[PDB]
Design a protein around this ligand. Structure first.
Ligand SMILES: *[C@H](O)[C@H](C[C@@H]1CCNC1=O)NC(=O)[C@H](CC(C)C)NC(=O)OCc1ccccc1
Ligand SMILES: *[C@H](O)[C@H](C[C@@H]1CCNC1=O)NC(=O)[C@H](CC(C)C)NC(=O)OCc1ccccc1
Lengths: 299, 299
């Protein structure tokens, strides 16, 4: 099984560039609103400790250069919502898809359309880590790139990119401008908390292995959810939620392997290792495939 | 550093559904021609051992149902070029990109847009293996999905999907209908030649590991090109040519690590193994990033 992004075309048609002075980044053009990171209004020097309310007071509509390719879209209104700017423009995007703004949970995956100067450059799958970072691939000028899922031609936007942490991982907001995690948009030294392994996704990957015939690791034991959660944390695995149990439902039904039975199989893998054996050809337990990713890739 | 695909929107606008009898697959709609695998004209019994020229002479234009979204396109002509069928339609694709048909070489990479019933489903990066298979994610109905590279508005189509081998790897043609590898479009179990590892790509990926702050595998040894190639061939790695050494030039200059110094690193890696350590989070030596892939992503 492979990491597979959603086709990016519906989002590509919504990418624009936003320039303030000499600072350019990307924006998301939906209907007659362009969404973008608010630090576009910062000069290099203002990014250490910016006062965004004060910086925005000095800006008018005419200070914002919004372009779709080289075609200017005139800004007729602006406001700030948390860490994002909303620039109302005079043209409704004719390629606006059916869309939603959603806030995802750690463990959930999404496709990222990496953009520079409003031009799409690449697409790849990311998982939100439990420490609310993503392991992305972003360069200078990538801010305003978005992450999304597509469900039946409806695009659910979940991520907008703002910053890189000193460990090389990345941090950003939802499309209402609220950061994932304890991060802020200031060019200050920030540290991601210690990360953990996404337990629900490892279990999804064990089900994927079982579906394909690799089931040596199935054992004869079961566990309670609470006992599993307490042992999992000793191995720096995330605890399972009730929602996690429910989204494993379809895979449990397909294989006939109860969710808590698979938890006991995983627990034995953590307490004893894999004893030189592999699962789906890998000696490592993969944790960036969700139960939906497994179902979507097998269907 | 992630496996990154090209944005797929320009190709999405070209995918259509092609039905003949009870067989359905995807087609690529460029200008007024639809390109699709020729086995669409085959029934179940036909597939087992088809005589394609004999099967195609007995087909009429109206035997082909081409659908672009909900709208049927009328077939007004049809010819066969090797394993690809060219259906002339009465409507030109209004969103035909600037495009070229190219045949790639083993070791080169491309993006795959996986499609079902003419609708795009996922996008991911593949490399043409030295044995001319690709390790894809394809299911029933995915034939006619295409692989491509994008260079400044120009889409270079290099692959069209036709089948899955018993080992689970995949085989297909260029857009002139010629298979990559010794394969045929017949429903029969076929084996590929013994595969080898793409050495120039492993070296590019090791440079990506260093660009991203990982150096544990480096050493103070050096090696000649020929002495490296002796060990490489012993481990079923493809030979490294002087052209490969040149293509790695920019990556060596960026890191200050001479290519033959990185070859000594890989030689030690091959002879000792990874000792259960990881490089860019991988327990295996990755060979599906070309030097260009690394440069584009890392700069
Ligand atoms: C937006 O394009 C840019 C994306 C960064 C740049 C390179 N790779 C990325 O992910 N975002 C920033 O440059 C961001 C702006 C702040 C106002 C949020 N600052 C940043 O990422 O630097 C982080 C940093 C923290 C502490 C010391 C030095 C740098
Ligand atoms: C086209 O949609 C389909 C794609 C395959 C189906 C499952 N995963 C894929 O990638 N191609 C075929 O079904 C292909 C048609 C032949 C006429 C070329 N046949 C095939 O892939 O099976 C080959 C095979 C034959 C005998 C034993 C085992 C495999």
């Amino acid at each position: 099984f492979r990491k597979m992004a959603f086709p990016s075309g519906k989002v590509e048609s919504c990418m624009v560039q936003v320039t303030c002075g000499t600072t350019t980044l990307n924006g998301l053009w939906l209907d007659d609103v362009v969404y973008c990171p608010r630090h576009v209004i910062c000069t290099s020097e203002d990014m250490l400790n910016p006062n965004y309310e004060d910086l925005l007071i000095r800006k008018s509509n005419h200070n914002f250069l919004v372009q779709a390719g080289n075609v200017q879209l005139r800004v007729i209104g602006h406001s700030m919502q948390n860490c994002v700017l909303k620039l109302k423009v005079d043209t409704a995007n004719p390629k606006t898809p059916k869309y939603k703004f959603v806030r995802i949970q750690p463990g959930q995956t999404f496709s990222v359309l990496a953009c520079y100067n409003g031009s799409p450059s690449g697409v790849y799958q990311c998982a939100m880590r439990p420490n609310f970072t993503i392991k992305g691939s972003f360069l200078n000028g990538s801010c305003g790139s978005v992450g999304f899922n597509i469900d039946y031609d409806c695009v659910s936007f979940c991520y907008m990119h703002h910053m890189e942490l000193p460990t090389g991982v990345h941090a950003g907001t939802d499309l209402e401008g609220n950061f994932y995690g304890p991060f802020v948009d200031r060019q200050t030294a920030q540290a991601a908390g210690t990360d953990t392994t996404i337990t629900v996704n490892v279990l999804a990957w064990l089900y994927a292995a079982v579906i394909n015939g690799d089931r040596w690791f199935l054992n004869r034991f079961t566990t309670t959810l609470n006992d599993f959660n307490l042992v999992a944390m000793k191995y720096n695995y995330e605890p399972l939620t009730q929602d996690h149990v429910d989204i494993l439902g379809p895979l449990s039904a397909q294989t006939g392997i109860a969710v808590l039975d698979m938890c006991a199989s995983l627990k034995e893998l953590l307490q004893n290792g894999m004893n030189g054996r592999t699962i789906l050809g890998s000696a490592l337990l993969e944790d960036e495939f969700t139960p939906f990713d497994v179902v979507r890739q097998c269907s």
